[PDB]
Amino acid sequence: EFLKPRLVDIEQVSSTHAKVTLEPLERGFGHTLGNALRRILLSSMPGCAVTEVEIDGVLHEYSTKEGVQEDILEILLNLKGLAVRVQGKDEVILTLNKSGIGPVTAADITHDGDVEIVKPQHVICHLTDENASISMRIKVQRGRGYVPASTRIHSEEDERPIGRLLVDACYSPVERIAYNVEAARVEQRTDLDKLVIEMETNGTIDPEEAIRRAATILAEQLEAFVDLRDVRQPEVKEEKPEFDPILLRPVDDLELTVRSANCLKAEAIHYIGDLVQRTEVELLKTPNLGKKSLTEIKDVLASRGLSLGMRLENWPPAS
Amino acid sequence: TEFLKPRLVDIEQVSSTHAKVTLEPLERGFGHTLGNALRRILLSSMPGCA
Amino acid sequence: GVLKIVKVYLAVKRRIQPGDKMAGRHGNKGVISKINPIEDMPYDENGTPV
Amino acid sequence: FGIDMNTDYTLEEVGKQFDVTRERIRQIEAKALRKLRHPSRSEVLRSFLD
Amino acid sequence: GPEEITADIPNVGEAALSKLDESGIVYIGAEVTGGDILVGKVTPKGETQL
Is the residue at A245 inside a domain? no
Helix axes B30-43, A207-226, angle to 10 degrees: 70
Tell me how the structure was determined.
Answer: X-ray
Which H/E stretch holds residue A22?
strand A17-22
CB contact under 8 A, E28 and A59: yes
Count up the domains in chain A and report the number: 3
Is the residue at A235 inside a domain? no
CB contact under 8 A, E39 and C6: yes
Q: Are residues A199 and A305 located together in one domain of the fold?
A: no
CB A124 within 8 A of CB A82: yes
Domain that holds residue A52: 47-171
Q: Are residues A154 and A269 located together in one domain of the fold?
A: no
Q: What is the largest CA-CA distance in chain B?
A: 45
For residue A174, the cross-strand partners are: A201
Residue A68 — left, alpha, or beta (φ > 0 → left; ψ -120 to 50 → alpha)? Answer: beta
Measured between CA atoms, how close is B3 to chain A, in angstroms? 8
Q: Are residues A112 and A159 located together in one domain of the fold?
A: yes
For residue A20, the cross-strand partners are: A10, A197
Out of A42, A148, A178, whose CB is closest to C38?
A42
CB E32 within 8 A of CB E20: no
Domain-ending residue, one of A126, A142, A171: A171
The CA distance from C5 to E25, in Å, is 11
Q: Are residues A128 and A24 located together in one domain of the fold?
A: no
Measured between CA atoms, how close is C13 to chain B, in angstroms? 26
Measured between CA atoms, how close is E22 to chain C, in angstroms? 15
The CA distance from A55 to A72, in Å, is 9
Q: Are residues A154 and A176 located together in one domain of the fold?
A: no
D46 close contact with A: CB closer than 8 A: yes
Q: How many CB atoms lie within 10 A of CB A15?
A: 13
Give whole-number Cα distances, D13 to A213, B23, D3, D25, D30, in Å.
83, 72, 16, 10, 17
Q: Are residues A42 and A179 located together in one domain of the fold?
A: yes
Q: Are residues A42 and A177 located together in one domain of the fold?
A: yes
- Resolution (Å) of this entry: 3.7
Instruction: Sort D9 into a burial class: Cβ within 10 Å, 0-12 / 13-18 / 19+.
Output: middle
Could you tell me which CATH class the domain D1-50 is placed in?
mainly alpha
Q: Are residues A162 and A178 located together in one domain of the fold?
A: no
Q: Are residues A8 and A105 located together in one domain of the fold?
A: no
- From the list C47, D37, B12, E27, the residue with the least C-alpha distance to A35 is C47
